Amino acid sequence: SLCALFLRRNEGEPFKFVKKFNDFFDWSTSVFSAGVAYILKRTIRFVLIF
Amino acid sequence: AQVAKETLGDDYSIAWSGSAYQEVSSKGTASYAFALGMIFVFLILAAQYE
Amino acid sequence: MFSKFFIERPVFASVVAIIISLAGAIGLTNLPIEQYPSLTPPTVKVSATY
């Protein structure tokens, strides 16, 4: 309810270090997605690590 | 209390008892109860009238 | 159903927040201040002389 009345849309000023850290974060998002996809195919070889 | 601080000695404790001690004991409560009462009144109505 | 209730009525949702926050602050005022939850065993002293 506090977002519907105060959350504006346009915001093209995400600074330098904030915009840099978010694109920094997107890299790990794909690496984690490919890492998960790596684990899902090599099944038993990661059950024993557990 | 004021006049006994004046006409007494360096060894006489102006002690208190009876009802005059129940009134001297403490203060600072008669207000911060009415205040929060009004705040709860205002919020109870502000939630009703929207 | 449940969340849409409060989104349509922001003043109501905010009042519930302040009520919890204020009445909780009332609890903060009237709370004992120890260091541990009475983790020390209570003792009883029996003294006699011969």
TrEMBL record, chain B:
The chain crosses the membrane at residues 29-46. It comes from the Bacteria. It is found in: Cell inner membrane. Belongs to the resistance-nodulation-cell division (RND) (TC 2.A.6) family. This is CmeB. It comes from Campylobacter jejuni. The gene is cmeB. The chain holds residues 839 to 888 of 1040 of the full protein.
